[PDB]
Design a protein around this ligand. Sequence first.
Ligand code: HEM
Length: 127
Amino acid sequence: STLHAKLGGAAAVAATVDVFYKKLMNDPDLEPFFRGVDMVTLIAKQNRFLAYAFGATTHYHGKDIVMGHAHLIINRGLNLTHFDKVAGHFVDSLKEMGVGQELIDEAAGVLIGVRPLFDPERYKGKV
Ligand code: HEM
C-alpha cells in the first residue's frame, strides 16, 4: 500500500517528518551539517529519506545518496558516527509515532544497507 497508509495516514507522515527533523536540529553533533541549508530543501530531504526507508522512492539509489553527500564526507568530516546518529533518530521517530516493529525492521534493513556509503575510508581528498 501507499507510504501514508503504512505510517498511519497523511497527517502522520508530516508529523513523523517534523519529529525526525527536530531531533536532527536539536542534536549538537548533527545540527552543524544543516547550517546554511534552506528549510524547503531540508523538509524535502526528510520526506525523501522517509520514503526511501520504506521503498516508496523510484529514482533514488545508492549512487544518488553518494552524489548528494560526498561533499560533506570530503570537505566537512561527515562520518559513520553521524550516520548512525541520524539513523537512530529516524527509528526513534518511528517508535514515538507508534509505528510497529515489522515496519521498524524494514526501515532498519534499508538504512543498514546504505551505511557503507558513509564510510570515509571510501573517499579521497578529505579534510
Ligand atoms: C540513509 C542515509 C541518508 C539518506 C537516504 C539521505 C537523504 C538525503 C536526501 C534525499 C537529500 C536531498 C535534499 C534535497 O535536495 O532536498 C539529502 C541531502 C542532505 N543530507 Fe542526507 N541523507 C542521509 C544521510 C545523511 C546524514 C547522515 C547526514 C548528516 C547530517 C545528512 C545530511 C544531509 C545534508 C546536510 C543534506 C543537504 C546538502 C546540501 O543541500 O547542501 N544526510 N539527504
